[PDB]
Design a protein around this ligand. Structure first.
Ligand SMILES: NC(=O)C1=CN([C@@H]2O[C@H](COP(=O)(O)OP(=O)(O)OC[C@H]3O[C@@H](n4cnc5c(N)ncnc54)[C@H](OP(=O)(O)O)[C@@H]3O)[C@@H](O)[C@H]2O)C=CC1
Ligand SMILES: NC(=O)C1=CN([C@@H]2O[C@H](COP(=O)(O)OP(=O)(O)OC[C@H]3O[C@@H](n4cnc5c(N)ncnc54)[C@H](OP(=O)(O)O)[C@@H]3O)[C@@H](O)[C@H]2O)C=CC1
Ligand SMILES: CCCCCCOc1ccc([C@H](SCC(=O)N(C)O)P(=O)(O)O)cc1
Ligand SMILES: CCCCCCOc1ccc([C@H](SCC(=O)N(C)O)P(=O)(O)O)cc1
Ligand SMILES: [Mn+2]
Ligand SMILES: [Mn+2]
Lengths: 411, 411
């Protein structure tokens, strides 16, 4: 009974890590079939992955490299995949009855589109992309209410940890990103752990002048550029607070960010009796990815065992909101609700990219995001799913444009 | 739907803590009926508990204070309990259809008797007593195989932690102290945490001359004298290694003792994928006791919330087997199997009591236990439950006598 999986964003950090744990898992016993691979424009790298995994489907988003892809794959003998392009290609893969689970390793708001179509096709969605949940949580909840057999299984490491800390006897009565989830699961409060990022010990004077080169250098594992910058600003953790709220139905007052620099405890769940359960491992994404594909079971691996005497010390401290103002902006946006999380995500996408490209300074990131949030006024939420998606898109686009306009003006 | 509970050993540390969380839990909403209280000889204290809780049944083990108990309880107006004595009284309570769950807070090998009769009556046994499991694990397993609806739910804090870390979706397919439990639950390895006791930082020269007064002073919560001495020698943790083996069907090579002096992580479970799940709270017995009575659910409490920034640091180190030789003796006994754990428990009961009463020195404890273990020869295991109990009793008694004889001889 092999598990038929598609990897969306297969050439990025998540996608390559997913293919690695799959490869390793299969050597112990052949449990996964890699049925589809989808990328944006990394045509040479997708070709190489195609030669190794020989999926039934290949898809490339950028039309300008589709012909190139076909020409390359011609060089793989005895291999006749279905080779698709763009939105229509993604939709065709999601509607295939040969695919059971889809790993969403596409970055940014863009990952919402495939997330939505995977749910609409009643698939198990092993969701790493958090911008989708932040920007469109209420929408996704409505979609999941309609598509009974669709499920989001969280891959983001902290949310995987939380999910692993739950009793599946209770989980199986509901599913993530549903009303009443915390009540059913007896959840009282979440400790959302953070690495703290590379800037965690810097002074205010030092933060003023940090660069994106400083944020990107010497990663534990290479993550994509966007998340790496968000880790440095701790906007990642702000996004993950909102993600927690939506996935697990936890009030913002019951989500506490804790800086745990060793990254061994990945997050913790306090139940209503005050007992706390936590998930622990070395800093890795292989367990989150694997668990999303095996849940509700676990399978044998040969991963390096955790050794607590080796670790020796685990530390916890609260983050400074003066140093990391993005965290507070995320809580404020989440608490306001409505489309404020959409605005938060969109403005951050622009500010993150500006800092990445050395156009603005560290504290300008939070300044831009704050100004966009203050400029937004709540809208009535469309009652129809199609209109609600259009409204999310329009607000996301406006907020990106507003961020860019603020940048353009101070120049 | 109140939960009908008996408290065995109601005047001791476990028993009084059980009555405290019950009392507190009932204020939030009335979920427990205290149906029976049983003690050895603490007749005045049992009377006081009777006046507060007004259980249907009262039992006192020591015949010489039974009349006194009756005379005292006469002073409680409008109260006509059933007042029993000894083994026959315990058996009558265990066979009552009005009792659903029994907390076993009786110390030492003596706690085996009520444990056995609670299982024979198909009850939920909230078992704090570990000497029963160490001395008679294979026997209890056979009994639990026959008595389908009987269950041991562990109360010992580390074993409660382990149990809490399991997925009830899998637990409910089996029960503790059963063959194949680890396979069903996907358990690979256990981290068995320890406080390390009051002697953890002493040198060999200092250990030579430690006293029982040193071991007993200034407890976090007052525990009984026997367990307190076993914590000081780390024989408690040796006993708990064997307890882990039997409760959870974990090989001794897959049980690792770790000294965690802050006592926040109560123990950890490594699953076959290498993910680790742990349970955390302040050092307390209220959660273990409560969970044993609410499992498979959890209920609301108003316990002090865990605060990780307050805790700040968690530490882990391996215990020194030179300083704490009892640990190694326990592993050796467990690995040999047969009745060696019975012998280990019995010899320790004598050696612990000798040290408590200032008759022997610290390293004489392990010396006596080691000599008794070396003197024992494996026996064929009786095939009949009744004969098997007689054989356990005979070996336990011999091993106590052998320990005392070794003491008597070196004097
Ligand atoms: N990296 C990590 O360990 C973690 C990541 N995440 C989340 O996972 C997501 C992915 O992050 P990460 O892997 O770091 O990002 P990367 O930048 O490393 O990878 C992004 C991937 O998405 C592909 N992609 C981009 N646009 C499209 C498109 N329109 N259609 C199809 N594929 C597309 C890229 O293709 P191409 O190569 O062709 O450009 C690439 O394969 C993010 O949402 C992030 O927050 C969460 C937890 C940790
Ligand atoms: N204290 C703790 O926090 C922990 C304890 N445990 C285990 O729990 C058990 C109890 O320990 P603890 O509470 O510390 O011990 P205590 O010495 O504090 O209490 C023992 C209790 O058992 C009663 N008792 C003794 N013999 C009999 C008998 N024949 N019939 C009925 N009752 C009897 C005693 O009655 P009386 O008062 O009349 O003498 C007393 O109520 C031990 O097996 C220990 O290992 C495990 C984890 C932690
Ligand atoms: C050896 C110790 C140092 C390990 C450092 C490597 O581990 C991490 C772990 C987490 C993260 C977070 S960003 C990525 C993410 O969201 N994930 C993995 O779920 P954040 O900084 O926001 O908490 C970054 C690095
Ligand atoms: C504030 C930090 C200091 C807390 C010290 C108080 O907590 C503990 C916790 C555990 C124990 C063990 S003996 C009792 C027992 O078996 N339990 C509770 O399950 P051991 O020493 O064998 O690990 C003793 C004391
Ligand atoms: Mn994360
Ligand atoms: Mn214990």
């Amino acid at each position: 009974k092999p598990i038929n999986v598609a990897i969306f964003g297969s050439t990025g950090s998540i996608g390559t890590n997913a293919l690695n744990i799959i490869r390793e898992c299969n050597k112990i016993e052949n449990v996964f079939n890699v049925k589809a691979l989808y990328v944006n424009k990394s045509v040479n790298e997708l070709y190489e992955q195609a030669r190794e995994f020989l999926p039934e489907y290949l898809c490339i988003h950028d039309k300008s490299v589709y012909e190139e892809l076909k020409e390359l794959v011609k060089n793989i003998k005895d291999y006749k995949p279905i080779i698709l392009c763009g939105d229509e290609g993604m939709k065709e893969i999601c509607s295939s009855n040969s695919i059971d689970k889809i790993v969403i390793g596409i970055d940014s708001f863009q990952g919402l589109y495939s997330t939505m179509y995977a749910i609409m096709n009643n698939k198990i969605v092993a969701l790493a992309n958090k911008e989708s949940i932040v920007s469109a949580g209420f929408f996704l909840k409505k979609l999941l209410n309609i598509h009974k057999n669709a499920k989001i299984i969280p891959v983001d490491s902290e949310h995987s940890a939380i999910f692993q800390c739950l009793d599946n006897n209770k989980v199986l009565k509901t599913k993530c990103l549903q009303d009443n989830f915390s009540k059913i699961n007896n959840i009282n409060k979440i400790f959302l752990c953070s690495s703290g990022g590379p800037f965690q010990n810097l002074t205010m004077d030092e933060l003023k002048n940090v660069t994106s080169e400083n944020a990107l250098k010497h990663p534990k594992w290479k993550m994509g550029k966007k998340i790496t910058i968000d880790s440095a600003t701790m906007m990642n953790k702000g996004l993950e607070v909102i993600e927690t709220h939506f996935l697990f139905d936890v009030d913002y007052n019951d989500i506490e960010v804790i800086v745990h620099k060793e990254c061994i405890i990945h997050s913790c769940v306090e139940f209503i009796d005050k007992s706390v359960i936590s998930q622990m491992y070395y800093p890795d994404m292989q367990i989150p990815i694997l668990y999303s594909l095996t849940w509700p079971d676990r399978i044998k691996t040969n991963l390096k065992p955790l050794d607590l005497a080796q670790v020796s010390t685990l530390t916890f401290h609260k983050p400074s909101l003066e140093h990391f103002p993005c965290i507070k902006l995320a809580y404020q946006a989440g608490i306001k609700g409505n489309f404020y999380p959409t605005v938060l995500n969109a403005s951050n996408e622009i500010a993150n990219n500006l800092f990445l490209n050395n156009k603005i300074k560290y504290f300008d990131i939070s300044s831009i995001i704050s100004q966009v949030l203050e400029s937004f006024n709540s809208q009535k939420v469309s009652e129809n799913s199609e209109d609600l998606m259009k409204q999310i898109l329009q607000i996301h686009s406006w907020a990106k444009d507003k961020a860019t306009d603020i940048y353009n003006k101070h120049n």
